[PDB]
């Protein structure tokens, strides 16, 4: 399948695409403003993620640091990113359908549209100034708006036992992006698409 990753923000991002224990395609790439990067993701992939990283540095080989979303200091992510990271999430060709979501469960760093480029299903978006408003205790120095599990490490925020409810903090993300997951047990805003669909991830969409 095809993912076209478009940086419509006015600042450079470093896009990332991982499943957790391996890269997807090249695993990451600088996208200056306006730059599109199309990747190939192998059908049937379960649990992949696409995110932006901000304020990175990489050297000639590729090793470095980012202030949001860092994946173990690699330009080319083979693992997931340090919060706060707005997340595009997907598992493809499940049993006849792909399922797409955007998640604020690790926080928010960059606004995002995640839309299908082939018919049958509707996209999802979170474009609101979450970082402009973000509650002080959830702010991240380095940029972005952390989730409460990251800041406080409680069973209720982290839904450790499989039981938890919404919170003042989950609800701050759900007031501003009802289509994105706001905590682990949120009512799913998942989208079911035909198996083998293609997609576009657009950062800073409304930019």
The Cα–Cα gap between 207 and 8 comes to 6
CA 72 and chain centroid, separation? 17
CA 59 and chain centroid, separation? 24
Question: In sequence order, what are the residues at sequence separation of 6 or more whose Cβ sits closer than 8 angstroms to the Cβ of residue 187?
Answer: none
Approach to solving: X-ray
Question: In sequence order, what are the residues at sequence separation of 6 or more whose Cβ sits closer than 8 angstroms to the Cβ of residue 13?
Answer: 7, 30, 31, 52, 53, 54, 110, 203
Tell which residue, 123, 116, 124, has the closest CA to residue 195.
116
Strands (E) located in the chain? 2-7, 13-18, 23-31, 36-40, 48-58, 64-68, 87-94, 97-103, 112-116, 124-126, 191-194, 199-203
The Cα–Cα gap between 147 and 24 comes to 25
CB 88 within 8 A of CB 126: no
> β-strands 199-203, 2-7: how paired?
parallel
The Cα–Cα gap between 67 and 119 comes to 37
Resolution (A): 1.3
Q: Is the peptide bond before 84 cis (omega within 30 degrees of 0)?
A: yes
Matching residue, tokens 């499989």: 162
Exposed e or buried b for every residue in 106-125, given b needs 16+ CB within 10 A?
bbbbbbbbbbbeeeebebbb
The Cα–Cα gap between 46 and 142 comes to 30
Tell which residue, 188, 146, 144, 191, has the closest CA to residue 169.
146
DSSP 8-state code for residue 21? S
Cβ burial of 4 (10 Å; 0-12, 13-18, 19+) is middle
| Terminal alpha carbon distance of the chain | 27
Q: How far is CA 2 from CA 8, 23, 28, 151, in A?
A: 19, 15, 15, 35
Helix, strand, or coil (residue 155): helix
C-alpha atoms less than 13 angstroms from C-alpha of 157 in its C-beta half-sphere: 18
């Amino acid at each position: 399948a095809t993912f076209e990753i478009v940086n419509r923000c006015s600042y450079t991002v470093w896009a990332a695409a991982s499943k957790g224990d391996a890269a997807l395609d090249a695993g990451g790439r600088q996208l200056n403003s306006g730059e599109s990067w199309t990747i190939n993701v192998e059908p049937g992939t379960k649990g992949g993620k696409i995110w932006a990283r901000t304020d990175c540095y990489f050297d000639d080989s590729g090793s470095g640091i980012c202030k949001t979303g860092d994946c173990g200091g690699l330009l080319r992510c083979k693992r997931f990113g340090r919060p706060p990271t707005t997340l595009a999430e997907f598992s493809l060709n499940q049993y006849g359908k792909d399922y797409i979501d955007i998640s604020n469960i690790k926080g928010f760093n960059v606004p995002m549209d995640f839309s299908p480029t082939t018919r049958g299903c509707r996209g999802v978006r979170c474009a609101a100034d979450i970082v402009g408003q973000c509650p002080a205790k959830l702010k991240a120095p380095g940029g972005g708006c952390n989730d409460a599990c990251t800041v406080f490490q409680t069973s209720e925020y982290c839904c450790t036992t499989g039981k938890c409810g919404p919170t003042e903090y989950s609800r701050f993300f759900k007031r501003l992006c009802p289509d994105a997951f706001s905590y682990v047990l949120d009512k799913p805003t998942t989208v079911t698409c035909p198996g083998s669909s293609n997609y576009r991830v657009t950062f800073c969409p409304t930019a």
